[PDB]
Each structure stands twice: as structure tokens, then as C-alpha cells.
Design a protein around this motif. Structure first.
Motif, PDB file in Angstrom:
ATOM      1  N   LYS A   1       1.475  -1.169   0.179  1.00 38.88           N
ATOM      2  CA  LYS A   1       0.011  -0.034  -0.272  1.00 38.88           C
ATOM      3  C   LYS A   1       1.333   1.122   0.130  1.00 38.88           C
ATOM      4  CE  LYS A   1      -3.835   2.015   2.106  1.00 38.88           C
ATOM      5  NZ  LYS A   1      -4.545   2.200   3.459  1.00 38.88           N
ATOM      6  N   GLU A   2       1.632   1.263   0.696  1.00 41.92           N
ATOM      7  CA  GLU A   2       2.573   2.381   0.986  1.00 41.92           C
ATOM      8  C   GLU A   2       3.661   2.843  -0.543  1.00 41.92           C
ATOM      9  OE1 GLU A   2       6.087   2.068   3.553  1.00 41.92           O
ATOM     10  OE2 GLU A   2       4.729   3.074   5.470  1.00 41.92           O
ATOM     11  N   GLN A   3       3.716   1.715  -1.495  1.00 37.99           N
ATOM     12  CA  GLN A   3       4.417   1.777  -2.290  1.00 37.99           C
ATOM     13  C   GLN A   3       3.138   2.411  -3.599  1.00 37.99           C
ATOM     14  OE1 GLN A   3       6.527  -1.480  -4.210  1.00 37.99           O
ATOM     15  NE2 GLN A   3       8.366  -0.640  -4.223  1.00 37.99           N
TER      16      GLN A   3
ATOM     17  N   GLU B   1       1.017   4.638  -2.735  1.00 38.64           N
ATOM     18  CA  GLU B   1       0.701   5.896  -2.256  1.00 38.64           C
ATOM     19  C   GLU B   1       1.918   6.858  -2.191  1.00 38.64           C
ATOM     20  OE1 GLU B   1      -0.003   5.138   2.376  1.00 38.64           O
ATOM     21  OE2 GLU B   1      -2.522   4.289   1.710  1.00 38.64           O
ATOM     22  N   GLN B   2       2.665   6.066  -2.246  1.00 43.81           N
ATOM     23  CA  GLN B   2       3.958   7.408  -2.954  1.00 43.81           C
ATOM     24  C   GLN B   2       3.928   7.151  -4.842  1.00 43.81           C
ATOM     25  OE1 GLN B   2       6.669   4.361  -1.883  1.00 43.81           O
ATOM     26  NE2 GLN B   2       6.562   4.701   0.193  1.00 43.81           N
TER      27      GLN B   2
ATOM     28  N   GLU C   1      -7.855   2.290  -6.594  1.00 38.03           N
ATOM     29  CA  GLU C   1      -8.007   1.334  -5.690  1.00 38.03           C
ATOM     30  C   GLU C   1      -9.282   0.493  -6.006  1.00 38.03           C
ATOM     31  OE1 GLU C   1      -8.513   4.199  -2.535  1.00 38.03           O
ATOM     32  OE2 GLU C   1      -6.587   4.229  -2.035  1.00 38.03           O
TER      33      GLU C   1
END
Length: 70
Positions: A2-4, A6-7, A23
Motif C-alpha cells: 500500500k505504501e508503494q 501511495e507514493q 483502488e
DNA sequence: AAAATGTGACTTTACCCATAACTTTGCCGTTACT
């Protein structure tokens, strides 16, 4: 995972609704199962990129693009 | 919502090689006629 994503969104500055569609597409089963039809050889292909089975309607039209993308 | 797979194993013609059972010919002998 999820972090990748988001970035990725932050780097490309995708809008809130665009992020919503991305999403939804990321977490959703395919809308319709590919039907045999009358003239198209259909089926499924294992993809190690996604790591899942991807469905193609035509083995000589959509499937080549799937091979490229994989 | 949709491209894009006919095969190939087992038959049937079709043409060639060989030989029988006669027709189809030339060639020479014979004979009627001049």
C-alpha cells in the motif's frame, strides 16, 4: 504494497476520484467471466507479474497484448 | 462480449508391364489373260 502505491499516487498527483478508481480496480474481482462466444478461442493465462490467472477473450488479439504486458 | 484450428487412415483411380487371341498388313508364289 500500500505504501508503494501511495507514493506512486503522490508522485503522479492522481486526484481523489482517480485514486478511488485505481483502488477499486486493484481490489475487485473481474466484472464478467469471459464467454466462449461463437468465433473466439477464450481462456485463462497464468501471470507471474500479478501472480494470478488473467482471462483473455481472444488468444490472438488480447492474448498477445497480455503477453507483452506480462 | 467476443476472431481466425482441419486432419490423416484407409480407399479408389489412373497409368504402366506382360501376354493371350485374334485382325491387319506387306511380300512373294501362283495363275488367268494378253
Amino acid at each position: 504494497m500500500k505504501e508503494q502505491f501511495e507514493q506512486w499516487v503522490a508522485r503522479l498527483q492522481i486526484s481523489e476520484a482517480g485514486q478511488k478508481i485505481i483502488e477499486k480496480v486493484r481490489s475487485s474481482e473481474p466484472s464478467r467471466r469471459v464467454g466462449g462466444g461463437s468465433k473466439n478461442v477464450s481462456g485463462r493465462y497464468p501471470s507471474r507479474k500479478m501472480g494470478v490467472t488473467i482471462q483473455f477473450e481472444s488468444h490472438r488479439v488480447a492474448l498477445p497484448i497480455i503477453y507483452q504486458l506480462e
